[model samples]
Target: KPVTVKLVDSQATMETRSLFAFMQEQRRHSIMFGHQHETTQGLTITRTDGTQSDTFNAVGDFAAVYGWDTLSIVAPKAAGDIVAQVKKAYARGGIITVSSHFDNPKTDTQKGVWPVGTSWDQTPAVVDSLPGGAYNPVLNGYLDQVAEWANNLKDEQGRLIPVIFRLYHENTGSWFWWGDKQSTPEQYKQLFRYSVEYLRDVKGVRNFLYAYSPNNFWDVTEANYLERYPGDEWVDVLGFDTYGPVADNADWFRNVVANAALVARMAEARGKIPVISGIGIRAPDIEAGLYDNQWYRKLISGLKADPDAREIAFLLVWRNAPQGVPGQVPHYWVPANRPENINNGTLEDFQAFYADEFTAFNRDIEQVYQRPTLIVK
Candidate 1:
């Protein structure tokens, strides 16, 4: 008999429950492919019309999953664009996962503070300023915007659309204010718990499944992975993000496989889904053509080389911005579905990754939200 699934949100919508169940069951068989900012931009394409355009067409289908950001959700113009695209993705039967690159609430742009408008501002004591701290109002205010946005996400049937919300991701690294070097583990847990509580309990939003992920590093172990964990009750997915090699380096492949497998094991022990939540060849690597022509195929093969690692539910790459930031390497994950890519073997290799039965693209699973039965916690 098929089993029901539960989410961190005890009152998660039917759509959310169905998605969790699907992921739980699906990961045991094949991995879903995902891309960030997929509909909005790509290496060789900028959306030209009202219709959505993505580089996935190189393989003739959309990716099974789509990634979005909450960095500017408080800004209506950017938020409106994301909201529209999210609904379109849901309508097309694609899964949506959201991550926040939220700017530090402690920064006072009005006062012309340093690092005022970026998530990268490694402002010390930022997490200390969360609820119950001096900046309680600011933290709650930011969460209010997130709650407002989440509460308004309803499909045509008026059912709340489900979203996988990965919060304070890559926490193992010190680049962000919420990272290990900046916030104490207890403080980190408090922020995560408070965020969830505010959204679910205070704001009355229940369409989210929380995912906890850390960036890839040399020493990823069961002990360290849970170092700042917010407990099982707070997270629904166990994930990690990895990037680079800039070449076909054996060490990169090994590290990714081991860490992916570790997450797989950890998720299994706790009844959660495992995912390579974020992945891609480093942008500079792609721009410089430094990686193997068969990079995509090799990545898939390397992960599947270990049975435990093969259990990951999905692998989502970073975005392919339409235009390169001046003085920075061009940003893109997947090869464009183009003739040049075909001739150069990048497109062909990516096609093989899509074609492999071990991987699932958009067409592989349809009617994802229409479950026959759904049991709640």
Candidate 2:
């Protein structure tokens, strides 16, 4: 598990057709590890010793940001120096995963939803509005701002750091406008591929690896998983996301792991990257003593012993929001720095997770930037 993930060499131009070598080398690594942190504040964790920063690396090897580039609803002011925070993550010897939760393009609200998501039927209208398509200014404005940030993001050394852009993720079953029924399967495909096409083909963004993650297993089958797949040419890594139990003693746990295993097998059958795109349970359970205090250790052990699940190059959890907030709900995922601390898992279980030889953190990375030029497969 060295820091040798093959990546786009630089800001040079690339074609999806030329990414075989990068993918081949990437297939050798095992779970680099990741945690979502919207801002550096997510890193400045509170603890009994007063407070601490960079605690994310104590249990994870990299950082992920969700909706950092969303037009207005989320990203405009909520991200808080996103470009700077991501640079800091790389400076710590890690990489990043960026998932987008874009705001409504046509209007800012729906009947009752905030950032009202565009309906599936209207997806064509949105896609057709891009610069080279319907040529609408409003929709393309969001895409343009996003591309500018992604294309120019770099590390302290100023070398372009690569990222996995997980676009319109968790659509298996969510209220987001991008999910099924919200947008037809064809429309979803267009949303996924067309965005990439604009960035890679139109904007010349070279430091990205595309990942498509559905929220659940639904019926736990491949066809169900790829219902909206844009095509191989439009994808790089294949993965799924879920949260709850990490032990084999439960039905839901086994079902999720089985789905992850199936995803790994599907990717291997075609020689591609597979991932546990996201995993984590709500902190409320821990706060109320609902689950094992050492759930973190149990899950890692369970996933590693899993038949083909360990083949994942990385595992990411939802971001650890601050201890107290109203609508956002703190302690939704990570530990809260309560006086006793054990109220959450970090007082003890977290320490064990960081110590496990198999679980990697930021300090564990090596030469993650050396990459191969995209080559036609």
Candidate 3:
């Protein structure tokens, strides 16, 4: 009840009202799960080929077809139709989540790193060259393309469907362009605020929510987690990402459970949705039968039993990759547990998870967006 949203529109749009109503009801229902869209042409959780959540932590087909340029154009698979992938997720009964790994607009990459500087500790000159805050042409251009995609997301009855945009995720690390060290906390906050304002105000992409995340708290305490926080007025959800407990690994679970609890209490204090944005151990680990084949069961049980941690609203697992897919280490990657295609959890892991009354999917939802959801697709 403390979490509130102020609609710019004097009159709330149909999509906005619906989304608000949905989240309220959702809190009492099942905690949702989401997967990444590794390959639109592969085995999706619900019958997708090549592969594929709680709607999909990210319907990522755009990246597969365009690499870092996904934000600038439509994925060829979507045939230049920006909304093509998003629509499919809705038809399947899922929430809309999009991840943006924008490789610096000023430069390029080799590994996941963006070569910000010598060891990336000295980039004041480059930062000056690019001028990131308040008026970055490159960022604006990128937002333009995103606006197009957001505007085009319409449903069967000619209505705009709400979406969740997971941008600048896991910035606690330096793997992507938007990661820490690449930008100052102030810069990251500005970029996040700018992106949301551009989408909702300038671009008129009203059907969307923004989520900020820092991949698990490696050395992060609660204060570290909120280091680059963009403030409540500029954000709608409080989220974190993780994949742990290491199956038989007790230390990881012990630490993670405590962190997750801290996260929930903090998020509630701020009136935001407390989410385990992403989580799940590798299928190979699952197949090794580590910690008893009930790895998922234990993970869920730990979080649920923890009175403070159990307050999390939803949880998203990674994509279900199938054997030999680009996202995995081979048939053994997240092996077996194949309930649908592969990955996410395994088929067996999912069967166990879905059967647990606490979890919910599109099929289980009452009226999420009036229909149906995929992987990081």
Kindly provide the TM-score of model 1 when superposed on the true structure, using C-alpha atoms.
Answer: 0.93
Clashes of 2: 6
Residues 96-185 of candidate 2: C-alpha lDDT, one tens digit per residue: 677776665655334255333443322324344444544346555666776777777766655566667777777766456566756678
Residues 34-60 of candidate 1 have per-residue lDDT tens digits of 988777767655563213545456777
Tens-digit lDDT track for model 3 on 20-119?
A: 4465456544566454553232232454432242123222121111011143242222222335556655655556666664435554222254344212
Query: Relative to the unseen true structure, what is the Cα RMSD of model 3?
Result: 7.3
Better candidate by lDDT, 2 or 3: 2
Per-residue lDDT of 187 in model 1: 88
Model number with the top TM-score: 1
Question: Which candidate number maximizes lDDT?
Answer: 1
Error of 1 at 188 (Å): 0.8
TM-score of every candidate relative to the true structure: 0.93, 0.79, 0.74
Shift of residue 216 alpha carbon in model 2, Å = 1.7
Which residue runs of candidate 1 sit more than 4 Å off their true CA positions? 46-50, 76-80, 108-115, 287-289, 372-376
Error of 3 at 26 (Å): 2.3
Best-to-worst TM-score order: 1, 2, 3
